[PDB]
Amino acid sequence: SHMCDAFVGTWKLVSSENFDDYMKEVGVGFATRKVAGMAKPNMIISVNGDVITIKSESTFKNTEISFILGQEFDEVTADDRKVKSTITLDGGVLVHVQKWDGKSTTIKRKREDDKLVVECVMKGVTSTRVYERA
């Protein structure tokens, strides 16, 4: 109860850094990188009991995940990877690990001032995606 309150809401992308390089490291192909890199998603986060839902809506792709913290689930990512994901809360940060084909990437979401800051890491490459309230 009240675990993720400060995440709940409707958020819009305001800045991005190094996302194309992150996508390259993940294995995303040229055309998907270009179209996906243009997107300005909204991220809609809600909680109902133990179930957290994160929706992403953009002109590129609309996706939605629902999950319970610590409980693995199957996810098809916007770039069409079929991954096994687990999301946990670590010191106030939502930590989302995706595993596929012997690879792994981690997406961290944290509240910083009035922003929701998303850090995506694949090996040595980090992208930072900043969202603000819609």
Ligand X SMILES: Cn1c(O)c(Cc2cccc(Cl)c2)c(N2CCOCC2)nc1=O
Instruction: Find out whether 108 and 87 touch, Cβ atoms under 8 Å.
Output: no
C-alpha span between 76 and 73 (Å, rounded): 10
Q: State the minimum distance, in angstroms, from the CB of residue 39 to ligand X.
A: 4
Per residue in 42-68, is it b (16+ CB within 10 Å) or e — as a string?
bbbbeeeeeebebbbbbebbeeebebe
Q: Does residue 125 interact with ligand X by CB under 6 A?
A: no
- Candidates 10, 18, 32, 126: give the one binding ligand X (CB under 6 A): 32
Q: Does residue 47 interact with ligand X by CB under 6 A?
A: no
Q: State the minimum distance, in angstroms, from the CB of residue 76 to ligand X.
A: 11
| 33 annotated to bind ligand | no
Crossing angle of helices 19-26 and 30-38, in 10° steps, is: 150
Region of 4-12, 44-52, 56-64, 85-93 interacting with ligand X (CB under 6 A): 56-64
C-alpha span between 52 and 5 (Å, rounded): 11
Strand, coil or helix: 37: helix
Q: Does residue 41 interact with ligand X by CB under 6 A?
A: yes
Nearest residue to 20 (alpha-carbon basis) of 8, 32, 11, 3: 32
- Candidates 21, 79, 104, 115: give the one binding ligand X (CB under 6 A): 79
Q: State the minimum distance, in angstroms, from the CB of residue 36 to ligand X.
A: 4
Q: Which is nearer to ligand X, 60 or 100 (CB)?
A: 60
Binding-site ranges for ligand X (CB under 6 A)? 23, 26, 28, 32, 36, 39, 41, 56, 58, 60-61, 77-79, 107, 118, 120, 129
